[PDB]
Design a protein around this nucleic acid. Structure first.
Lengths: 46, 271
RNA sequence: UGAGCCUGUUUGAUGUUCUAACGUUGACCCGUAAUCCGGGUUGCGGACAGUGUCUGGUGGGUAGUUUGACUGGGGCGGUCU
RNA sequence: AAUUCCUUGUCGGGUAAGUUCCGACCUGCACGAAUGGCGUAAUGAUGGCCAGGCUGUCUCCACCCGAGACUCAGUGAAAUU
RNA sequence: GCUCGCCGGAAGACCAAGGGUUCCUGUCCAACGUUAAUCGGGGCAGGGUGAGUCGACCCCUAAGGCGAGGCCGAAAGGCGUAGUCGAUGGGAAACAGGUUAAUAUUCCUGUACUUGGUGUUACUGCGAAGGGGGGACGGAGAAGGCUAUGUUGGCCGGGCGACGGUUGUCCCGGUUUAAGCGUGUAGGCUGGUUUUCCAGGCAAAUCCGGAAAAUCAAGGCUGAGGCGUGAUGACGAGGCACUACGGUGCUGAAGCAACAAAUGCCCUGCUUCCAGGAAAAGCCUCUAAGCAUCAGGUAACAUCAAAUCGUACCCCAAACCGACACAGGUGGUCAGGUAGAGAAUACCAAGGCGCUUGAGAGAACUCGGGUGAAGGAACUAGGCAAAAUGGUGCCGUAACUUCGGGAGAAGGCACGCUGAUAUGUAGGUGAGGUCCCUCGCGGAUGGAGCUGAAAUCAGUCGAAGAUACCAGCUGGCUGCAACUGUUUAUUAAAAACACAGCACUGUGCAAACACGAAAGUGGACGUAUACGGUGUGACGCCUGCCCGGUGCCGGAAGGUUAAUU
RNA sequence: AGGACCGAACCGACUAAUGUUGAAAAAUUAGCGGAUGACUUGUGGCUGGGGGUGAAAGGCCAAUCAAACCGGGAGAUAGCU
């Protein structure tokens, strides 16, 4: 039975990547929020 | 020629075809082609703005001369041709100086004919003149609406327009809808009427035929629910209400024209 | 064309004509190496069209709510001073 | 009658026997002409009825071949209280 | 180590996507492995990935994303021009043999090819952000030439058989060789050359396009396969001496022909149909401003350069998606023998496995199968389930019909083996020999050898010759929707939805209509034989009366009526 | 020639039995429908919540849909247990 997750690095990076986040005003807010909380990993990029 | 097909299958029982043995078999002219892509009805926002469109066959665009400039140089007809972007055939012409062009095909035009455009051109089919030089009571096609713009009226298969009266700097025309209109006398037009009048005597035969051309199914509003259309609901089959569009306006009788900028060029409306 | 003033003087409404505000999703030149944009010349409409404030009409297309109590179970009947 | 409450209406066919099926009658509680009327060859993992062949579906059950259930050695849950 | 069973269009071999040391060697058995474990895809330590030609990076674009100035919006922001990105698509070049415990078109041996820079010699009009060619394109169908591959014969090396016979029409094994270079065949397409002139290709053209004379009839482009060279080489059963069980040095026979044959190549070809079938660069040509002693261009020699990242292993699965060492899901390539129409079905080859708890007994009852005396739907809401028919060739076949159908209607007869026709028949391929010739991968005649259906007559065995796996049950009367299609992922597949056809109504182009505070965009690079909305649903015969109510369309003389003064 | 006919690969889901603390949070075995077309599959792209897409079942939008998920107003209100 086909399930929901079907991996693809290209799509992953084009969807939730660092440059994608920085391209928009709200993505910078996501980054600032995570930085304030103090996370070890910011984005999905290796 | 209209030909019925034999009933060798249920999808072939009701098929009538139009066949013309004079159309060219082979590739088209290359220097006058362009690529055309499909849309599905979607606009620049990505939304369906016109319904029931999608799919079909790949097509290429043939450039056509609705201007008919180039006065004074005769041209000869080379071959007639098929066009997937319209309901009328096209013709290729070669000019005396070595330039080729595509034009609309009128009735009775065949290979080996001579055509011309200008103020002093003859009066015969396929020739172009400003409407200040055509006799009153003539049949024309490919009519302009502004001097120097391009043909915009009577461009489909079998159609034409009639000149009725001339008075001043204006000409009065009767259109295919039963309407009288006024346009400037410096516009252009072409003698005769458009060809391929057999186009309306065809029967498709099966749903795949309409799917080949890019038409998707139509769903009735009485088969939906009250949250989709003003015609939905019911325990059984019920209507009990005045017919309306999918957005709440009355079909079957109401009017929708509102244009005060152009009301002065209408003499009498379609009856 | 009906109305004041001292046939002569202002303000109204109806219609003909004009060009100078305004429109041009008609043609040509330049920025420019470009079917966006701006400038220039020339045709075509022209005080119409269109927009702002105010005002009468229509408006389940969309939104927020109302639709009482008694009762040998509730509803239908009947009642409530 | 995909519609008929009274109703298993009445007459004929098929069965030894037929509240279902087929053909008619008109007393249509409450059919009817593009929210279409009456027909129709071919097509349907569509609803109803009847025959030939075939059988453990059944009178009415008997034997046999394999995996569990039982005994021995190792590992080892659960709902509820 | 010797037997036995299972798969074999897979349960074999190689990849992509996705994981990331699971790969090889040494040592250990606490916890993990549904049991024991000396074993492991487990613990610890060391080793392993070698490129001018394979990929990525690079040159060019599709759908689409961003977007200098620009237009638009309370802010935030939206859409777009010149540009610049984005593969699932276009763009140079390499093959055999040997080798490690683990890498191979990368390492060693033998023989090849592709693009640029620099110097010399010889000939000389070169030049882009511009003009032209080319790249460059659909569905279906047919038969002609071939190869991969197989079968038999010939040749070389062994054997003479645990129990009757086996010196022969006997048994087992081998018979392999590439890219590059020359030859330009089966076949496909197109007439060649010179001179004059011209309102076209934003300007120029010797290039493209068009008109007019003369002459010549054979010029050019394309193209699988075969043949020679590569090759006095490599490989090859076995043999000459030693073994750590992975091996060293040497030596080495034959290495031919006939037949059948693809869904692969010629073939982006040929024939036919309507629904009419991508873009840009590399590449070939022509010139403009400009330089002409220069710079530059074509040809020959010598020299240099081709950097950086991936390369282990799994990959229909115990290593990926399902919490699990889970009976599920996952795209591409390769295609042996005997029967058979076949990539179906049965037994095998190369190769790979026996699925990580066992040993006994032979109770009721549950699950998956086999057989049944007499009867044959008497069972049940209902023939639910089971039983039954099942191939090829020939005879033969109703009502009704839109003349295509119904139809495989229904129902019957033959089917194995051996001999003769004919020591292998009708067909298919085809060497030698004789002539002709522009002398070649030629033409005509010729038949040695190889392969091989269907049929008739006459005999013979058994209860049964389509013998196993495989493989339609048939007929009569009715309701609904004309027909092929779609739908409630996870209790409803239908009479519901769609449909070809028909009618009403709107729309004159800056169209009606829709997404948008606006700019803009789709409708459409379309123009009433075209577009949007609503109802009915092939086809045949048809579709009657009512405008009082509510809608819609036209009128405008009378009554009522807003802001404003 | 054909939304033609029989039938493997490929795409579906009509009947029955098993399973229901399952081998599986929708499967297995024996039968079943389409199979040159309105067909089927790989890679990348676009449409965002009173919104989209819908051969129309209130179907689908990450095991969640008569108004998705996440964080805030927030200790919303609760004549009721």
């Amino acid at each position: 039975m086909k399930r929901t997750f079907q991996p693809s690095v290209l799509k992953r990076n084009r969807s939730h990547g660092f440059r994608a986040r920085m391209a928009t005003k709200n993505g910078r807010q996501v980054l600032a929020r995570r930085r304030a909380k103090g996370r070890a990993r910011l984005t999905v990029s290796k | 020629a209209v030909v019925k097909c034999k009933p060798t299958s249920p999808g072939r029982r009701h098929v009538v075809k139009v066949v013309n043995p004079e159309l060219h078999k082979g590739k088209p002219f290359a220097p006058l082609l362009e690529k055309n892509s499909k849309s599905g009805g979607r606009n620049n926002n990505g939304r369906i703005t016109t319904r029931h469109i999608g799919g079909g066959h790949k097509q290429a665009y043939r450039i056509v001369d609705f201007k008919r400039n180039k006065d004074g140089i005769p041209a000869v007809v080379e071959r007639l041709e098929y066009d997937p972007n319209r309901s009328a055939n096209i013709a290729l012409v070669l000019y005396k100086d070595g330039e080729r062009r595509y034009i609309l095909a009128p009735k009775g035009l065949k290979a080996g004919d001579q055509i011309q455009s200008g103020v002093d051109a003859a009066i015969k089919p396929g020739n172009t003149l400003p409407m200040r030089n055509i006799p009153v009571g003539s049949t024309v096609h490919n009519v302009e609406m502004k001097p120097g713009k391009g043909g915009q009226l009577a461009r489909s298969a079998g159609t034409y327009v009639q000149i009725v009266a001339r008075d001043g700097a204006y000409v009065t025309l009767r259109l295919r809808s039963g309407e009288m209109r006024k346009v400037e006398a410096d516009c252009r037009a072409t003698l005769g009427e458009v060809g391929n009048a057999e186009h309306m005597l065809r029967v498709l035969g099966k749903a795949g035929a309409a799917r080949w051309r890019g038409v998707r199914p139509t769903v009735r509003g009485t088969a939906m629910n009250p949250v989709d259309h003003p015609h939905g609901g019911g325990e059984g089959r019920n209507f009990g209400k005045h017919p309306v569009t999918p957005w709440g306006v009355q079909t079957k009788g109401k009017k929708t024209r509102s244009n005060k900028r152009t009301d002065k060029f209408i003499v009498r409306r379609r009856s």
